[PDB]
């Protein structure tokens, strides 16, 4: 009954059964279609997203919340 | 397409950063009752599955939904 065993069970429910991460990512891109119109904008978003995911302040945030943070950081430049 | 960008972003979040696996491990390290008691862990998984069905939870992380499940067990 370890943290590892419980992480495996809970992550499989969230990610493999519910597929929450993929659902959230699709929601974000449906709400922000500029990222499908400009390869350059998507590259910029993926750079900001990879930076957000390095931050300990972002460690417990969802893909939706971190994509949205990446988008907002692009807008605030 | 939105599906292509979604797939790439999810691949970065899931497999490059391991964010969900790290969040689940963080949660369990912070809530040792669930490693000490198999009964508590089974109740948490029951509640967690219920939280994940709620539209209000659709954009929340695995950490935030495990916390919400935990708080529901404490509120009963
Ligand atoms: Cl998946
Ligand atoms: Cl997966
Ligand atoms: Cl997923
Ligand atoms: Cl370029
Ligand atoms: Cl994931
Ligand atoms: Cl995934
Ligand atoms: Cl995962
Ligand atoms: Cl508590
Ligand atoms: Cl509390
Ligand atoms: Na643009």
Curated annotation (Swiss-Prot), chain B:
Give the location in the cell.
Cell outer membrane
Ordered alphabetically, the record's keywords are: Cell outer membrane, Lipoprotein, Membrane, Palmitate, Signal, Virulence
Q: How does it sit in the membrane?
A: Lipid-anchor
Recorded family membership = Belongs to the InvH family.
Name the UniProt record assigns to this protein: SPI-1 type 3 secretion system pilotin
- Record note on disruption phenotype: Mutant shows decreased levels of InvG/SctC. Deletion of the gene reduces the invasion efficiency of the bacterium to 70-80% as compared to wild-type in vitro. SctG/invH-ssaV double mutant shows reduced secretion of Sip effector proteins (SipA, SipB, SipC and SipD).
GO CC terms in record: cell outer membrane
Stated role = Involved in the synthesis of the type III secretion system (T3SS), also called injectisome, which is used to inject bacterial effector proteins into eukaryotic host cells. Pilot protein that is required for the proper localization of the secretin InvG/SctC in the outer membrane. Required for the secretion of the Sip virulence factors.
Report the main location listed first in the record.
membrane
Name the species this protein comes from: Salmonella typhimurium (strain LT2 / SGSC1412 / ATCC 700720)
Question: Which top-rank group of organisms is this from?
Answer: Bacteria
- The protein's gene is named invH
Disulphide-bonded residues = none
